Design a binder for this molecule. Structure first.
Ligand code: 91Z
Ligand code: 91Z
Ligand code: CA
Ligand code: CA
Ligand code: CL
Lengths: 306, 306
């Protein structure tokens, strides 16, 4: 028993982390086979960043301008191109530790692990969600750019995120591994603000199922609701609409606990309208929306990876 | 910016995890050089566990009775002994992935990462604290026994915990790597209860320093207090006494923020007596006591490991 915010084991991603230096700028790179992926603003100095011409700045650079280190060892760059907001540096050595991997673009509401890195060396690992407003609530300092976020499915690392920037309010923005931003953000030092966020309703329900499984059951009421009446209440409290797909995805947790999704919706409606009255659920005083239904089943079923 | 509950990168510990089977019972082992460390109750069946004679049960076992798998590969056991609550199985192959490591016995209040494992395969990683009552608030299912907890100091893995058991209220108990229990617990299925817990005062202060560093400053008052007057208030709210050692350990965060430890004590006293009035600190509605001063400086300074 017990429920913790749990990250994927980081070992397969640790073996892929390198340092990329171009001039004054060092950040992190991801070394898969014979390619290093990093943020394209490694080619910028301090003044450049207000409004850089990347395509232009990159012409003034030769392969030899990029210093790539995998721990001690220097990797020799033998090619380089820009894809959207990411650099691909071809190196003369394939990474012998390259895991089986995929590049995925995750959906808002989905979770992943971040391996926070400085100078190509891993700092820590923590679980995040892609917020509805396409930001993450991370912990990133200057030097963390190029750190990646990922899921592991048995032996396969699905890379979904590369860190580029911080926004007002201490939230973070980045790209998929094809260098396309999540949300409307751009890799320029301009006035950019995150959209208003919303609470990921399906994840809050998944977490109430995690509470029941763990014997924290005080908030279960005797009532049901319709999907329509539920979404009218959710709307007031800045919660995303619950869809039928969301209901279907909650099916297995519903069946394991013997609590219909619409009955759990009736309990969430009461919590939203009445508050928690100083009580906790799974040790928390606020409703948690950063656990997917999959995360709940995995953690409560003890699913493992290669 | 941003503050997350962050685990150590798990890669060095992942390479040490194996499966140990004795009869019907499979749990996890830690393979360092040519020795596998696991919980000694791997030699028990279901009925044994009410009050096992370990010394006795272990005599009926030969080396060949222990099936040890490192992924696919079987390891051949060529020796076995019991040290307190742990088995040492000598194997004919030294682990080529053995990191530089130490066995440490941590102090209550100190944090570590758990690599949750099933059938020798890693599940997830999360940060825990050794509670004052010698329990941890973990996430452990049947099959997780032998999972280890650890700190990384640059290249060196300090093993401090091996998982043995769950207690009433969904909290967990285990041993150091010399097989001695943290707290008064025993590896028998008896009525055992955790002592009353207390809040780790020094860690709450470290976390308020983390809030200020991150620009969450609303709870800072204009007052100071003496150490004695502070500890009289702490006592009422079931907080540990703050010692001079604790004050000295908070010195660097005090200096970085320009807030004397006794001034921050005055602010915590007001929070304890008045509550948070529906406000949050670093996104939390409750005071957090599972971040050490070291954890705060590391996460806010971007310290990395080999
Ligand atoms: C990254 O380049 C690195 N070397 O680590 C760095 C990471 C951030 C520093 C602080 N925390 C981070 O995650 N990224 C950047 O410096 C990016 C790059 C230029 C500006 N920028 C920002 O993050 C700007 N941040 C910012 C705010 F957070 C808030 C605000 F009001 C204005 C800001 F500029 C690029 C986007 C090219
Ligand atoms: C471990 O042996 C394994 N194979 O994973 C297992 C781990 C626990 C199962 C549930 N969560 C765990 O962390 N340990 C045990 O089964 C230990 C071993 C015998 C009993 N036991 C318990 O954990 C008993 N738990 C228990 C309570 F949690 C609460 C309660 F009121 C009574 C209990 F027995 C040993 C201690 C030898
Ligand atoms: Ca050269
Ligand atoms: Ca044999
Ligand atoms: Cl909370």
């Amino acid at each position: 028993s017990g429920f913790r915010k749990m990250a994927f084991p980081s070992g397969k991603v640790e073996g892929c982390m390198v340092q990329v230096t171009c001039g004054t700028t060092t950040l992190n790179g991801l070394w898969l086979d014979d390619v290093v992926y990093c943020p394209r603003h490694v080619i910028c100095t301090s003044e450049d960043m207000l409004n850089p011409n990347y395509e232009d700045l990159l012409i003034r650079k030769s392969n030899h301008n990029f210093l790539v280190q995998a721990g001690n060892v220097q990797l020799r760059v033998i090619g380089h191109s820009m894809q959207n907001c990411v650099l691909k540096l071809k190196v003369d050595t394939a990474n012998p530790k390259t895991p089986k991997y995929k590049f995925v673009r995750i959906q808002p509401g989905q979770t992943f692990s971040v391996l926070a890195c400085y100078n190509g060396s891993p700092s820590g690992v923590y679980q995040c969600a892609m917020r509805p407003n396409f930001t993450i609530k991370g912990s990133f300092l200057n030097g963390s750019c190029g750190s990646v976020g990922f899921n592991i499915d048995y032996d396969c690392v699905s890379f979904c995120y590369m860190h580029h920037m911080e926004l007002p309010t201490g939230v973070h923005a980045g790209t998929d591994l094809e260098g396309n931003f999540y949300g409307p953000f751009v890799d320029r030092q301009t006035a950019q603000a995150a959209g208003t966020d919303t609470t990921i309703t399906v994840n809050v329900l998944a977490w109430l199922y995690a509470a029941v499984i763990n014997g924290d059951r005080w908030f279960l009421n005797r009532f049901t609701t319709t999907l329509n009446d539920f979404n009218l209440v959710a709307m007031k409290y800045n919660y995303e609409p619950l869809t039928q797909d969301h209901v279907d995805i909650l099916g297995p947790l519903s069946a394991q606990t013997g609590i219909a999704v619409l009955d759990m919706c009736a309990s969430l409606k009461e919590l939203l309208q009445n508050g928690m009255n100083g009580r906790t659920i799974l040790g928390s005083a606020l409703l948690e929306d950063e656990f997917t239904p999959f995360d709940v089943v995995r953690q409560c079923s003890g699913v493992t990876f290669q």
